[PDB]
Design an enzyme around this catalytic site. Sequence first.
Site, PDB file in Angstrom:
ATOM      1  N   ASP A 218       0.786  -1.231   0.000  1.00 42.53           N
ATOM      2  CA  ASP A 218       0.000   0.000   0.000  1.00 42.53           C
ATOM      3  C   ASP A 218       0.827   1.294   0.000  1.00 42.53           C
ATOM      4  O   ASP A 218       1.908   1.348   0.582  1.00 42.53           O
ATOM      5  CB  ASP A 218      -0.928  -0.005   1.227  1.00 42.53           C
ATOM      6  CG  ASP A 218      -1.790   1.251   1.330  1.00 42.53           C
ATOM      7  OD1 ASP A 218      -2.709   1.419   0.491  1.00 42.53           O
ATOM      8  OD2 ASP A 218      -1.560   2.055   2.263  1.00 42.53           O
ATOM      9  N   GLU A 248       1.324  -0.752  -4.956  1.00 39.87           N
ATOM     10  CA  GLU A 248       0.427   0.280  -5.462  1.00 39.87           C
ATOM     11  C   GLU A 248       1.185   1.610  -5.496  1.00 39.87           C
ATOM     12  O   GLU A 248       1.319   2.271  -4.472  1.00 39.87           O
ATOM     13  CB  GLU A 248      -0.830   0.489  -4.602  1.00 39.87           C
ATOM     14  CG  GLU A 248      -1.739   1.546  -5.259  1.00 39.87           C
ATOM     15  CD  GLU A 248      -2.550   2.391  -4.296  1.00 39.87           C
ATOM     16  OE1 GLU A 248      -2.048   2.746  -3.202  1.00 39.87           O
ATOM     17  OE2 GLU A 248      -3.696   2.732  -4.663  1.00 39.87           O
TER      18      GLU A 248
END
Length: 469
Positions: A218, A248
């Site tokens: 993340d 990400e």
Amino acid sequence: LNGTLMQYFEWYMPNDGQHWKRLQNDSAYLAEHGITAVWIPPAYKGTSQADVGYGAYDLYDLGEFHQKGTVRTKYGTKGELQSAIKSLHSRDINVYGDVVINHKGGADATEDVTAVEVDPADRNRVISGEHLIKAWTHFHFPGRGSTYSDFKWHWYHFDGTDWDESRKLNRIYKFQGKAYDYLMYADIDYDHPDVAAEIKRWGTWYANELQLDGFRLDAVKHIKFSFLRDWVNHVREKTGKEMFTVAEYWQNDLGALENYLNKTNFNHSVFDVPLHYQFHAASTQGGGYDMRKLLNSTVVSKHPLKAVTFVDNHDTQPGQSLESTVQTWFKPLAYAFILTRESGYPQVFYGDMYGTKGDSQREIPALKHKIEPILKARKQYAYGAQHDYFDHHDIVGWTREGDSSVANSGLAALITDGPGGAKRMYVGRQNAGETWHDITGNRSEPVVINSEGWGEFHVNGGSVSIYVQ
């Protein structure tokens, strides 16, 4: 044989603690439809029971201790999570855990810390002299204690925060003297030896406690790249497992993405953000979009083996932070694009499958029935050499000659954002004389392949056709 990933959560799912059970109960279906891996939401304790999981309070509390007023997380208890994973593995489906490590939220108490204020434009331009503030930086986990880990967090483990509790002020603070709830989160300092050592240790603890097969990283755009690279190498080494990992890095720029890949030694994948934006752009221009553009500026086009292709996720869904939802009418075309082409590790979105539960009047409806045929096309037909036909502004397509290894494999796909039409495509002389049919059922007419392996394929306007067998 084709691998298929599935983000198994949506932002607006109900806080009823049944998610891990649903996942467990959904294993047969997932396997039926060729899903080979599932990316689950953050399984650790957030700032509240309702936290989607990105608040990240205690990484060692997988819904096991009474903290933040609840034992279970929004999704369930550690046990339910472990049962779900067991059933997934029994079905040969891998599980990737989400990794939220750029910040910590919901500190147990504030700490008096010396800070300097920085420019919102240039976050490394000091615009204030040193001064005392009260920051939410002390984490001691009263409900867990020292179970699994005795590491306690303090202000010096962080770079800063955006909230001064003493003055109830929102400014960008950077801690000095070192060796809207999100405004109170503290940004983790990876320059601190104890911090880097601890996150790597939690990493392998995490992987072992849940028997994870890989990770989803993340918000990597703001984490030190070298660290992320080492953290991945570390977990793979200590664990002895492949640990597929996808990061990400939210930037609609192939340049920034390639740099990220080079700085991380290509040891993990990245989500194809640019492809998503083209999907969004095409679904938004009512047939004015040049469809030949889909082949450029994306990560799959340049680093096919390092790209995880997707249509929408929990950030881009209606009402979210990076809202840029691919319009429903275009959604099945985008899915055919990522699921039937040879390049990329495609990801299906839970929200697209079962619909999103926000309260906008533009929520995503459950598209399961439109997607299932494309999953079947990927599972049983998307094999062999591919031929691209991006020779038209509106209608484009591609073929897969199929592979002897997989029976009756082979397909001809066609998508258009404008009017319908036909296109002759080479399907493999090996397929000569066969009669193909649109698996999506959008077109009823059969197409028989000539003796030279060619076919005249048709497609309706603003639609998708995938001919097989």
